């Protein structure tokens, strides 16, 4: 399978500029073998959270060839587990071997491939390392929830983000959770006896400021606390629901960069081999 | 060595069709033969039955 996004007539002063797009991904809506350029298109920058919400319902595809007539592509992941392709870094950060890649909408805007001939423009989304897109998305959703090099939020769909966050956070509260909460003093006194434990707890940990302000009595034994046990259930819920927390907020990883012969790192704006996962 | 190996396991696995036919013959001839004891009188009283 290969997607054929047909192109209208374009300006020779701009067709050539669009030929410089060989490793940027685009977001279709359905996977029919043929399609049109007028279809895969987004307006200029705005509402980064709206954009990242848009990048989850529509599976993406990477382009490979740009001839003056057609433009091939490849559905990113629909059945492939090792389908090796190429895509170029278009983010501000570099990327080393091995690490997974994530797709996040373009920040600050102003990166729009304007096509005055077809009157339509695109926004090829950037590619970041995983662990850093995590920080980016976390910062954006925290600042959006604050509303009861920075774009202004919208307060319209930010409530979707706040809701999706607060739901997963609330469903962490189980009758066993308070049993784990009844040791904050017992934890802190352990933190100050070993260097590693003290390094684990951060500085603005927002709980270290609780261990010295409030006291809690022994926790009341729950109902039928003589057959089952709530600590293990609580922790299983925690791990199962945290292993995917960032996914339902940010974007799932889609590919990991592999390089067999080339230099270890790829600087920004250079093609890099990759395997999709 | 690898070729001798093939030739040998070849000549080792599939003629167990010959042995296997020899087996199936008995396995079928057994499940349809009544014992002579229950059959020697059965032919003697034949005709006058029912």
């Amino acid at each position: 399978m290969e997607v054929d996004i047909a192109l209208p007539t374009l300006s020779p002063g701009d067709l050539s500029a669009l030929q410089r797009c060989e490793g940027r991904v685009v977001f279709l809506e359905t996977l029919r073998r043929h399609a049109t350029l007028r279809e895969v298109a987004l307006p200029c920058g705005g509402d980064v959270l709206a954009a990242m919400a848009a990048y989850r319902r529509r599976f993406a595809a990477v382009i490979t060839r740009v001839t003056p007539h057609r433009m091939l592509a490849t559905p990113l992941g629909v059945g492939g587990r090792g389908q090796s392709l190429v895509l170029q870094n278009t983010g501000p950060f570099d990327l080393t071997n091995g690490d997974h890649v994530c797709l996040v909408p373009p920040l600050l805007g102003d990166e729009c491939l304007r096509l005055t001939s077809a009157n339509l423009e695109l926004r090829f989304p950037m590619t970041l390392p995983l662990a850093q897109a995590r920080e980016l998305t976390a910062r954006v959703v925290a600042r959006a929830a604050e509303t009861l090099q920075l774009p202004p939020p919208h307060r319209d769909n930010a409530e979707a983000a706040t809701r999706s966050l607060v739901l997963n956070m609330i469903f962490l509260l189980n009758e066993g959770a308070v049993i784990l909460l009844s040791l904050i003093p017992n934890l802190l006194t352990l933190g100050a006896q070993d260097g590693y434990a003290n390094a684990v707890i951060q500085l603005g940990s927002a709980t270290r400021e609780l261990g010295q302000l409030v006291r809690q009595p022994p926790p009341p034994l729950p109902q039928d606390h003589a057959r089952r046990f709530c600590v293990f259930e609580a922790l299983e819920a925690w791990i199962a629901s945290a292993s995917r927390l960032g996914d339902t907020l940010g974007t799932r990883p889609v590919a990991r960069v592999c390089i067999f012969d080339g230099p270890p790192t790829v600087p920004p704006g250079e093609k890099a081999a990759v395997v999709e996962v | 060595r690898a070729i001798q190996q093939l030739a040998r396991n070849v000549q080792a696995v599939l003629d167990s069709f010959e042995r296997g036919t020899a087996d199936q013959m008995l396995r079928v001839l057994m499940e349809k033969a009544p014992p002579l004891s229950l059959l020697a009188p059965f032919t003697l009283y034949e005709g006058r039955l029912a």
Binding site: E2, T74, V78, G79, G80, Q83, S84 | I3, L6, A7
Partner: peptide, 23 residues
């Protein structure tokens, strides 16, 4: 009595390269 239908198999596994690259 030893040569090429498993030495058959053996050489011309050859005319199979796509095993396509597409999902």
């Amino acid at each position: 009595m030893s040569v090429q239908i498993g030495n058959g198999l053996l050489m011309v596994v050859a005319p199979g390269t796509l095993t396509v690259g597409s999902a």
